[PDB]
């Protein structure tokens, strides 16, 4: 498949990802540059450095500036509504 739905359960106190990209850059969708060992993202074993995030809990990140997309992810981790985050990701490069 082009994309894969990855559920990241909040199994640790931290999420542990670093992202680049967004509408205001040459990487239109946010891309994972780092995965910290011990965080919820590394704990799920399904997220990878280079993964491009298309959606967060069904919300598209297309058109969102870097800081808006980062804020969407930060709020998905802090919310008490659910104890996980659903990331729709792709291993393919996304340049437009």
């Amino acid at each position: 498949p082009t994309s894969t739905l990855v559920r990241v359960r909040k199994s640790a106190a931290t999420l542990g990802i670093a992202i680049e990209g967004g509408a205001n850059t040459r990487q239109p969708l946010p891309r994972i540059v780092t995965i910290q060992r011990g965080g919820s993202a590394h704990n799920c074993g399904q997220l990878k450095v280079g993964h491009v995030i298309l959606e967060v809990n069904g919300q598209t990140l297309r058109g969102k500036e870097h800081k808006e997309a980062a804020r969407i992810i930060a709020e998905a981790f802090k919310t008490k509504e659910r104890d996980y985050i659903d990331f729709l990701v792709t291993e393919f490069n996304v340049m437009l």
């Binding site: 670093a18 850059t25 540059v33 450095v49 870097h66 980062a70 930060a74």
Partner: peptide, 13 residues
């Protein structure tokens, strides 16, 4: 690796 160039932001989450 980074695909964006230095001026472009990185956010730690």
């Amino acid at each position: 690796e980074r695909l964006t160039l230095p001026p472009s932001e990185i956010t730690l989450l």
